Symmetry: D2
Subunit: 333 residues, 4 copies
């Protein structure tokens, strides 16, 4: 009569998951931002866990769990989990990779166009009371807005979202390059894209750089004081991937010195983001959104339902064989 315990770590709403797990697991929530806020009962008895991106699990955090057997990220990115240590400790880790692909690609294109077209900045100027009566004043307030056709969009990471961005970018006349050192040769041919071998080549030829790679152990601060200097003078930077990929120190100085004309960021090294704190406090030509590229009403539901099914498959079946999106089978023993 005793069911396994499943805990929603960094959240409180479990409404979507309940119908799928009702007869399978007892569902509790922690609404926690760190391991220090998880009730002892959870650490001891929790067999499964659901979590988003607002809490990190190190080996130290993972070792506090005594019965945990699966973690499911409600989302694609799993950089916030020590995946290797989870496998060493016998904990399967899964993600939801497909739900918000096109939502994120559309958010990225929105930011790209918001830089080339300055719509968001033009709206601000009107909210601030700027009066734009003459054509000379239109040119002035819209200074920086550039023609898109002929421009080169450089994609770092041509996975699910990267490919979706590439196909959308082609519709506007962008010349699309991409850098992805983990794919085999020939993917550029199917999608009619141009490929480059190094990060330096990508930054050197791109008028607008957009990040679409996972954050792994080999690309933290991929955009740093060194690689920022490899970018075109007056280029754009867009990041809907992970904030850990950009050295905000180097980015702030680049915006201030005009080496980078503008930047649009949905993610940041330290989240939540605030224009009153951080290395970007006074950075100009900066657009930001609070890690919302993924969100739609349908997507939010679809990924929670998928994550709930993965939990069910783990409790009901054999780990890791019954799992559809386990991302650490190699490390699991």
């Amino acid at each position: 009569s005793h069911m396994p315990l499943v805990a929603l770590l960094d959240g409180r709403d479990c409404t979507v998951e309940m119908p799928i797990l009702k007869d399978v697991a007892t569902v509790a929530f922690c609404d926690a931002q760190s391991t220090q806020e998880i009730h002892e009962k959870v650490l001891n008895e929790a067999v499964g866990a659901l979590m988003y991106h607002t809490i990190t699990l190190t080996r130290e955090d993972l070792e506090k769990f005594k019965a945990l057997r699966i973690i499911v990220r409600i989302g694609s990115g799993f950089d916030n989990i020590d995946i290797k240590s989870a496998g060493d400790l016998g904990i399967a880790v899964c993600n939801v990779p497909a739900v918000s692909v096109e939502e994120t690609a559309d958010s990225t294109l929105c930011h790209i166009l918001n830089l080339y077209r300055r719509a968001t900045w033009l709206h601000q100027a009107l909210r601030e009371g700027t009066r734009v009566q003459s054509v000379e004043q239109i040119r002035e307030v819209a200074s920086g807005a550039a023609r898109i056709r002929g421009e080169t969009l450089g994609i770092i990471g041509l996975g699910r979202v990267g490919q979706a961005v590439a196909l959308r970018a082609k519709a506007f006349g962008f010349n699309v390059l991409f850098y992805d050192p983990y794919l085999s040769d020939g993917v550029e041919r199917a999608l009619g894209l141009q490929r480059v071998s190094t990060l330096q080549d990508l930054l050197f030829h791109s008028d607008c750089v957009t990040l679409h790679c996972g954050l792994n152990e080999h690309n933290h601060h991929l955009i740093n004081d060194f690689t920022v200097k490899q970018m075109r003078q007056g280029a754009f930077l867009v990041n809907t991937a992970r904030g850990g990929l950009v050295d905000e120190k180097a980015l702030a100085q680049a915006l201030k010195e005009g080496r980078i004309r503008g930047a649009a960021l949905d993610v940041h090294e330290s989240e939540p983001f605030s224009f009153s704190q951080g290395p970007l406090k006074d950075a100009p030509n900066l657009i930001c959104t609070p890690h919302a590229a993924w969100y739609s009403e349908q997507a939010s539901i679809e990924m929670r339902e998928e994550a709930a099914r993965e939990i069910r498959r783990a409790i009901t079946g054999r780990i890791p064989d019954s799992l559809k999106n386990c991302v650490n089978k190699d490390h699991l023993t």
Copy 2:
């Protein structure tokens, strides 16, 4: 030794046009907002005129010119000129129809995505100090953001910009309908679009309505208290065409009552626009830009050079035969 006089009515900068007209016409500027601000010398002696969109010419205004023989709009729209009366008075009217086509289509897609993705509103909330730490808070602050695929984009006016928008919209998964009662049947087939016969059908099936038609004598307040009721509950409205097409009274009430979830406007019934005056003073979910959809550094130059060449062709050749983009040959006698 006496050259014809050409006047830039509603502007002052003539730098781009001078190299093309130096040996052909004397160039002066008026920097005028109305006919009342034009120097008497211009009204009497001006043979040609260059003007943007910030000044209107009625028959009353046109009759004040005693030597004018051609007007060239530096831009595509010529609704601000009494075209028929200009032809009656023997004045050719020309425009520049091709320069800013893709700039405007990209601005339109930016506004479309800014509504579906709420990037501009999410940026404001961060500037306003909103703190978005939990996923529940992300869902809250981004409430209204919707998935694009499957949504129906309704285009009113499938000309140069409309077709450019249609092709871009298809890349995001939009289902594209269009209404244009002046085209012959078969244009929908070449571009693979669906066509509807009436404005009511367009508004009835569209989740997002975008205007791309010229303002003529048969579509002022095309979007009015009556036709607004024919739109889907919670639909979007985008207008980069002409402000005279929308009854801002009806639009304000629709936004306030939630019948329309959001609106993005680059043009307005009375320009320049201000959030502190007009029927849209307190309208919610409203994005606005100061008639800047056309602008790029290249476009601004290209259209001024084309307009200068048209002037030259008129002074040097025979009106209207030597004109490339005369829009009132039928009325000219």
Copy 3:
């Protein structure tokens, strides 16, 4: 109790049209190839006429009709009718312009690919008993097959079919140019195409030329001994438009001398076509189809139903106001 007479000139099957015209007109057929084969009753009493492309009507032919008031081409092209003389004689002429647009564009792409890929010629070689065992033999039998990406496709006439071809050609990596001296500037921008001003420029830069213009009084033998010399050495020629546009004499010599590597023709100066007669008797690298680019089971029905409705509208309403696709309103008096 007496109904008007409507005659299907160059056909016999009236099954599709009968349900639409039953209570409106008496329907007869002539199954005629020339005016000389039309029964006297038809010439005297026929008020309306339906015809395809296999019969020509000169002023001499038109003058033989004493009551005819409308002609409806079951199809888009109306070059086979003296349109001006028909208007002088008070005869409205209409067409069906939209039905087979995409069928024809798909046929054109089939011919284009059949030249670049030599599928049809490779099939023939297998039917002829050629044995292709080694790679060296594959290269030999497929000699001439070329990579498409980077190649330039030159479109002459960017109307309904031309635009449909252009959009399909872009999917294969073609660089698309077009020549159309009757369109206004700016259509190239909406569809992202490159435009040229003269026929010579089109032929000079194109690796594959495809015709998509109507046959009018200013382009008979548009491809002639002179303009053929303006084409690239080893270029392709495709014609799904009208045979009168090509001088088959010049074309045969070009194929024989290798100036043109191959040609695909759905239409010919004299139809029906036969490989045993005509200037193309012994021309090599020649593909031909019997004027079938338009045909699909749905298209054949759709255009006959549309043509029947046009007839009905003419008999029931006022000519030319009630007509949807009258192509000679200017000449009608």
Copy 4:
């Protein structure tokens, strides 16, 4: 002063490879169709081997080599090599996966259109002397030609060529489904395609089935007497992948009984192909090409140069680390 020996097994021309291997290896050719035709010197001393698709290497064949250390397929498919046994024997196997991707996709679209549009069959009828004078005769000779828009194209194997086909098929109005049980979920979203879970679903919903998967140990005769019955009545079949995927027995009967309206085959169970032998001797509505989907003058050179470089990398460096496209690293010991 003694260099390693490299042999071109099933070919004779080594001109392209010589400049790359001149100072690295002695190059000989065998022009062999089977292992029985290879000179004893080659079997004993050959360190590297180059081969196309016209010779098969079993474990029995592989065991005859006493010094062979790498095989390089000049092409993508390596089904003609016992890959596992090659690894057991310490032989690295490599391929050239990217060269002819778009050539093959264009050949596939040519065959697809040749079925829907019957261009190749219409050309034959003209070569055979068929006279097509009336529209009724055009409909007759072109019977079977169908409208493409709305039709469903089912892709089996969405790799390099499959994705290239999918993007081209979308330009014609196809609804594209694909079946590929080896990809992870989410690839359909990036390319905007619909995905199905089983082969039966693919065949059940597809009007035209096109094969684009490698031939492996789990899909020989994937199209068989059983799965052919799961296809739509009157559907099309296209195969530019491998002939071993189709049971030509079942295919012949399907074409004869009309269950399949037509088939286009670039590959066959037994190659070379002949219309006078095999289960397809008398099959109707059959188009065939002699395994030429890959060929272009540029592609033929590019893959031979890549294959030569792979050989060089193997002789010069460390196997398998220095290899770019080794397809049997797992089996190599």
